[PDB]
Amino acid sequence: LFQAKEKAPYTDEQLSAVLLNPDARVVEDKKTGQLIFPPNFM
């Protein structure tokens, strides 16, 4: 039932930019089914 995370939904370059674009939103990645900040989230 519990299943822990490891990676952030973003990556280390996106990090600050997600922290600064309040309209940043994830998408479901169609290949992995994960929720991630898409590379073009800005």
């Binding site: 039932l1 519990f2 822990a4 995370k5 952030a8 939904p9 997600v18 922290l19 309040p22 309209d23 940043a24 939103r25 994830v26 998408v27 994960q34 929720l35 900040f37």
Partner: protein
């Protein structure tokens, strides 16, 4: 500390009783700043609290950062760390029975 395990599972159970399978779901709709945590306790991890005084005074084996598990905020930190990645506000009430 065992109370952390109680909190983690109560949290996940609450997510499921909300019909949510992955907290990152929120980040479709809201910014990673907008998610907060205000879970608290009468006191922190009783194991760590006790062991740090009593058992170290008897020179027994220990994991060394044990002090941190004695703090009330740490259970909330663990919930965030492993499940949420939130940037939002985190607060920590203390009221023994009324917390």
């Amino acid at each position: 500390d065992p109370v952390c395990l109680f909190v983690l599972v109560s949290t996940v159970e609450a997510l499921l009783s909300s019909g949510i399978t992955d907290p990152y779901e929120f980040y479709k709709y809201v910014h990673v700043s907008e998610l907060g945590n205000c879970i608290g306790s009468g006191m922190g991890g009783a194991t760590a609290l006790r062991g740090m005084h009593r058992d170290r005074f008897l020179d027994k084996p220990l994991q060394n950062d044990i002090l941190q598990e004695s703090f009330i905020n740490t259970m909330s930190a663990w919930v965030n760390m492993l499940l949420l990645s939130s940037s939002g506000p985190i607060k920590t009430p203390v009221a023994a029975c009324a917390t």
